[PDB]
Amino acid sequence: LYFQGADSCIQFTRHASDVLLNLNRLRSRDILTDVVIVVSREQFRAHKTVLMACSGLFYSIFTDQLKCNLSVINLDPEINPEGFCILLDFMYTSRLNLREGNIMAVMATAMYLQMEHVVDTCRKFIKASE
Amino acid sequence: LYFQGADSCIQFTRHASDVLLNLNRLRSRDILTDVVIVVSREQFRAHKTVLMACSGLFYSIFTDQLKCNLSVINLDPEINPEGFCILLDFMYTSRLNLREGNIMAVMATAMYLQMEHVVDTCRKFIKASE
Numbered sequence: 001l002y003f004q005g006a007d008s009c010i011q012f013t014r015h016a017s018d019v020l021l022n023l024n025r026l027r028s029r030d031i032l033t034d035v036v037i038v039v040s041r042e043q044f045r046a047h048k049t050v051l052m053a054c055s056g057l058f059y060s061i062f063t064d065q066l067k068c069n070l071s072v073i074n075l076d077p078e079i080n081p082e083g084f085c086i087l088l089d090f091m092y093t094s095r096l097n098l099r100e101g102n103i104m105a106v107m108a109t110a111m112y113l114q115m116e117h118v119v120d121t122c123r124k125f126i127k128a129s130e
Numbered sequence: 131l132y133f134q135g136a137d138s139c140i141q142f143t144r145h146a147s148d149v150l151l152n153l154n155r156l157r158s159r160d161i162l163t164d165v166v167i168v169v170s171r172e173q174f175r176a177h178k179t180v181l182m183a184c185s186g187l188f189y190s191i192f193t194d195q196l197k198c199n200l201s202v203i204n205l206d207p208e209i210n211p212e213g214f215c216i217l218l219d220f221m222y223t224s225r226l227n228l229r230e231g232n233i234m235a236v237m238a239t240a241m242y243l244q245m246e247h248v249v250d251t252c253r254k255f256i257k258a259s260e
């Protein structure tokens with residue numbers, strides 16, 4: 001459960017993942033969600049803080065004095081809703097459901113959202129086939 | 131950076147800790163903090179979702195229909211502010227600054243906040259001296 005960290009502190013091995021699991025539980029129950037992300041027809045409820053923690057685009061939007069209080073955010077209508085859904089699930093779980101059928105949409109969405117590690121991972125999996 | 135999870139998904143090893151680090155960065159800059167916790171004289175700004183993820187007491191408070199929207203929460207005046215500070219830092223970092231001088235205050239605060247793993251850890255470190 002815990003160990004002696006490199007610093008003075010006792011560090012809890014699974015704490016960050018346990019927190020993320022609880023944040024995903026709140027999302028699943030729509031508890032304290034404070035924004036709706038609109039992608040084409042689709043709507044996705046989330047917590048701004050989680051979106052900011054995972055995405056350079058959301059970090060930029062919600063640190064903007066005018067946009068920080070917005071309850072609705074519309075994404076570029078060219079964004080694939082399934083690609084966005086896969087990335088939102090990844091934000092809340094650390095698991096990326098990458099498949100041959102969705103990798104291009106996921107990569108394009110991750111580029112737009114400025115999710116660097118996901119973009120790089122997509123690029124590596126694409127290179128593996130070529 | 132990533133591995134093949136037990137499920138179909140690609141899993142990112144450090145994602146949950148990277149998210150928690152970013153949430154702590156937002157806390158340090160007072161960005162999107164939505165509650166102030168008052169302990170005696172002291173005030174602590176935080177994100178309700180993080181508090182709920184880490185504490186049975188905060189989970190109960192912010193899932194209550196009446197209390198969920200409160201911007202200010204007063205804790206029991208008998209709570210030690212340093213003990214609360216150590217636990218709030220732990221929530222956002224996974225690191226618990228447990229010392230001989232603060233262990234009793236930290237344990238009492240963790241019991242009040244319903245932070246089970248911290249309570250159990252305090253109990254184990256206390257037992258080690260006796």
Ligand SMILES: C[C@@H]1CN(c2ncc(Cl)c(Nc3ccc4c(c3)n(CCC(C)(C)O)c(=O)n4C)n2)C[C@H](C)O1
Pocket residue numbers: 052053054055056057059114115116117145148149152153155156
């Ligand atoms: C001083 C400030 C600190 N910082 C930061 N702080 C807080 C957040 Cl929410 C945050 N989130 C954020 C910002 C940019 C991101 C970002 C999050 N992620 C996700 C990073 C991760 C490791 C979680 O995958 C990215 O890929 N990019 C490009 N970032 C990086 C910024 C540039 O500068």
Ligand SMILES: C[C@@H]1CN(c2ncc(Cl)c(Nc3ccc4c(c3)n(CCC(C)(C)O)c(=O)n4C)n2)C[C@H](C)O1
Pocket residue numbers: 015018019022023025026182183184185186187189244245246247
């Ligand atoms: C169905 C629902 C799911 N659940 C839950 N969901 C969301 C959150 Cl924010 C949340 N957070 C929460 C609640 C209680 C906690 C709690 C968080 N922590 C922290 C747990 C942790 C592993 C992060 O240290 C505790 O020690 N206790 C007792 N809990 C447990 C509750 C009892 O039942």
